[PDB]
Amino acid sequence: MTDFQKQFFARLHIEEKDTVSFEDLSNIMYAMAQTVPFENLNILEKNFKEISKENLKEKILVNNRGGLCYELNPTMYYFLKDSGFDVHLVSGTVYNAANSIWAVDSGHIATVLTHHNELYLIEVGFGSYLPLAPVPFLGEVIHSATGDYRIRKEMTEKGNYILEMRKDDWTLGYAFYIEEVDEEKANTAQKIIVEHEGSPFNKVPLIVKLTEDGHASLTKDSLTVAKNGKKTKETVTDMQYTNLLHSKFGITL
Numbered sequence: 725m726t727d728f729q730k731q732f733f734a735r736l737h738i739e740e741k742d743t744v745s746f747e748d749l750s751n752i753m754y755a756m757a758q759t760v761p762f763e764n765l766n767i768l769e770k771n772f773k774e775i776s777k778e779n780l781k782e783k784i785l786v787n788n789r790g791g792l793c794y795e796l797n798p799t800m801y802y803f804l805k806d807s808g809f810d811v812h813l814v815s816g817t818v819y820n821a822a823n824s825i826w827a828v829d830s831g832h833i834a835t836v837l838t839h840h841n842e843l844y845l846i847e848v849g850f851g852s853y854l855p856l857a858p859v860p861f862l863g864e865v866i867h868s869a870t871g872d873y874r875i876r877k878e879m880t881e882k883g884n885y886i887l888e889m890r891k892d893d894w895t896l897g898y899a900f901y902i903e904e905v906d907e908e909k910a911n912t913a914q915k916i917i918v919e920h921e922g923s924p925f926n927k928v929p930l931i932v933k934l935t936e937d938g939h940a941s942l943t944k945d946s947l948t949v950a951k952n953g954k955k956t957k958e959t960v961t962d963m964q965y966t967n968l969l970h971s972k973f974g975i976t977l
């Protein structure tokens with residue numbers, strides 16, 4: 725068991741395990757969603773670092789922060805790698821179904837896992853749109869509390885595969901290429917999301933995390949808490965913003 729693995733189990737508040745199985749992945753992903761939030765604050769504080777195993781262990785596992793896709797998915801990638809799984813990073817581009825257009829090119833990073841000769845997409849970083857389990861490339865629908873998810877082989881101008889989702893009809897989440905990439909592509913996604921003028925993540929604070937009974941979202945101005953059949957939206961002032969970061973998301977800057 726490496727230090728990365730130990731800090732990871734600790735971060736997720738789940739049992740240490742010297743042998744991690746495939747059947748375990750779903751519950752680790754669920755635990756990761758409950759504990760590690762999607763957040764962009766290091767872009768705004770201008771203290772993002774190079775994407776690496778050490779920097780990420782320190783930011784996410786030691787300092788109990790969250791991150792964006794190019795931080796959360798490589799984090800899981802490293803955990804999965806030390807756990808003996810055959811894993812790879814892939815690059816893609818998110819689609820903005822609302823406005824019917826692509827997000828910034830090559831802004832997304834994700835993880836693919838090989839088990840028993842079959843491919844699974846491991847997705848823990850796509851905001852709150854989380855499958856909470858591996859998504860089989862064979863095409864099977866994964867049902868989670870955040871919605872439905874499936875992979876399709878499909879050439880677009882942003883990849884040769886797609887992650888589709890709902891919840892009302894199937895809509896494109898992101899397109900990606902199955903071709904393997906490394907940390908340098910991850911650092912490039914960061915640069916893109918930090919710098920590009922059309923990036924959704926370099927203007928205002930954005931923090932989301934799943935919870936027991938739904939999810940919670942925070943911005944410069946408002947806190948949204950969704951439970952089942954109930955949503956609360958409320959204004960947040962600068963004075964309440966530090967407490968909320970800590971109390972709802974375990975974030976201390």
Ligand SMILES: C[N+]1(CCCS(=O)(=O)[O-])CCCCC1
Pocket residue numbers: 819821880881894895896
């Ligand atoms: C296929 N598509 C996405 C459609 C968007 S939908 O929400 O309906 O799934 C349209 C532009 C070409 C590449 C992406």
